[PDB]
Design a protein around this nucleic acid. Structure first.
Length: 50
DNA sequence: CAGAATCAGCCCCAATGTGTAATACCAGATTTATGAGCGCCATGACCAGCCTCAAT
Protein backbone atom coordinates (compact mmCIF):
# COMPACT_ATOMS: atom_id res chain seq x y z
CA UNK A 1 0.00 0.00 0.00
CA UNK A 2 2.86 2.40 0.75
CA UNK A 3 4.41 1.53 -2.62
CA UNK A 4 1.07 2.19 -4.35
CA UNK A 5 0.68 5.51 -2.52
CA UNK A 6 4.14 6.51 -3.72
CA UNK A 7 2.94 6.19 -7.35
CA UNK A 8 -0.77 7.05 -7.24
CA UNK A 9 -2.17 9.55 -9.75
CA UNK A 10 -5.49 11.30 -9.17
CA UNK A 11 -5.76 12.97 -12.59
CA UNK A 12 -7.07 9.78 -14.23
CA UNK A 13 -10.34 10.07 -12.29
CA UNK A 14 -10.28 6.50 -10.95
CA UNK A 15 -10.62 5.73 -7.26
CA UNK A 16 -7.58 4.82 -5.19
CA UNK A 17 -8.83 1.33 -4.27
CA UNK A 18 -8.61 0.02 -7.84
CA UNK A 19 -4.98 1.12 -8.15
CA UNK A 20 -4.00 -0.05 -4.65
CA UNK A 21 -5.52 -3.54 -4.94
CA UNK A 22 -3.09 -4.62 -7.67
CA UNK A 23 -0.04 -3.51 -5.69
CA UNK A 24 -1.28 -5.04 -2.43
CA UNK A 25 -2.07 -8.41 -4.00
CA UNK A 26 1.23 -8.42 -5.91
CA UNK A 27 3.19 -7.76 -2.71
CA UNK A 28 1.26 -10.43 -0.79
CA UNK A 29 1.77 -13.03 -3.52
CA UNK A 30 5.47 -12.20 -3.88
CA UNK A 31 5.95 -12.58 -0.12
CA UNK A 32 4.09 -15.91 -0.17
CA UNK A 33 6.22 -17.18 -3.05
CA UNK A 34 9.42 -15.97 -1.34
CA UNK A 35 9.24 -16.81 2.37
CA UNK A 36 6.57 -19.48 2.90
CA UNK A 37 8.70 -22.62 2.43
CA UNK A 38 11.64 -24.17 4.26
CA UNK A 39 13.44 -24.60 0.92
CA UNK A 40 13.22 -21.55 -1.32
CA UNK A 41 11.71 -22.04 -4.79
CA UNK A 42 11.92 -19.43 -7.58
CA UNK A 43 8.85 -17.43 -8.57
CA UNK A 44 8.72 -18.87 -12.10
CA UNK A 45 8.83 -22.45 -10.80
CA UNK A 46 6.17 -21.64 -8.20
CA UNK A 47 3.97 -20.26 -10.99
CA UNK A 48 4.59 -23.40 -13.06
CA UNK A 49 3.62 -25.60 -10.10
CA UNK A 50 0.46 -23.56 -9.51
C1' DC B 1 -16.81 8.30 74.39
C1' DA B 2 -17.67 7.10 69.44
C1' DG B 3 -15.58 8.02 64.78
C1' DA B 4 -12.68 6.32 60.80
C1' DA B 5 -8.50 6.34 59.11
C1' DT B 6 -4.07 3.64 57.38
C1' DC B 7 -1.59 -1.06 58.81
C1' DA B 8 -1.12 -6.25 59.56
C1' DG B 9 -3.96 -10.25 59.72
C1' DC B 10 -6.99 -12.97 57.26
C1' DC B 11 -9.40 -14.73 53.27
C1' DC B 12 -11.14 -15.20 48.19
C1' DC B 13 -9.48 -15.61 43.63
C1' DA B 14 -5.64 -16.81 39.65
C1' DA B 15 -1.60 -18.76 38.47
C1' DT B 16 1.98 -22.46 37.73
C1' DG B 17 3.61 -26.86 38.84
C1' DT B 18 3.32 -32.38 39.35
C1' DG B 19 1.52 -37.30 38.07
C1' DT B 20 4.89 -45.46 36.22
C1' DA B 21 7.51 -51.14 34.04
C1' DA B 22 11.13 -52.98 28.95
C1' DT B 23 -1.74 -14.33 -12.26
C1' DA B 24 0.23 -12.33 -16.09
C1' DC B 25 4.04 -11.01 -19.13
C1' DC B 26 8.18 -8.23 -19.96
C1' DA B 27 13.33 -7.32 -20.07
C1' DG B 28 18.25 -7.87 -18.37
C1' DA B 29 21.87 -10.74 -16.03
C1' DT B 30 23.96 -15.22 -14.58
C1' DT B 31 25.59 -19.91 -14.83
C1' DT B 32 26.23 -24.80 -15.78
C1' DA B 33 27.60 -28.03 -19.98
C1' DT B 34 29.65 -28.96 -24.16
C1' DG B 35 33.42 -26.46 -27.70
C1' DA B 36 38.54 -27.32 -28.03
C1' DG B 37 43.57 -26.67 -26.22
C1' DC B 38 48.25 -26.60 -23.49
C1' DG B 39 50.59 -29.28 -21.15
C1' DC B 40 52.37 -33.54 -18.31
C1' DC B 41 53.10 -37.46 -14.82
C1' DA B 42 53.73 -41.49 -15.86
C1' DT B 43 53.23 -46.19 -19.95
C1' DG B 44 56.13 -48.81 -22.93
C1' DA B 45 60.90 -49.14 -25.67
C1' DC B 46 65.55 -48.75 -25.64
C1' DC B 47 70.68 -48.34 -24.08
C1' DA B 48 75.71 -46.94 -22.15
C1' DG B 49 79.02 -49.52 -17.85
C1' DC B 50 79.82 -51.08 -12.57
C1' DC B 51 78.64 -55.23 -10.36
C1' DT B 52 78.96 -59.90 -10.30
C1' DC B 53 81.27 -65.04 -12.20
C1' DA B 54 84.88 -68.27 -14.92
C1' DA B 55 89.42 -70.65 -16.66
C1' DT B 56 94.66 -71.40 -15.83
Amino acid sequence: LMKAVDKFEYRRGYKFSTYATWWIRQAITRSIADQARTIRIPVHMIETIN
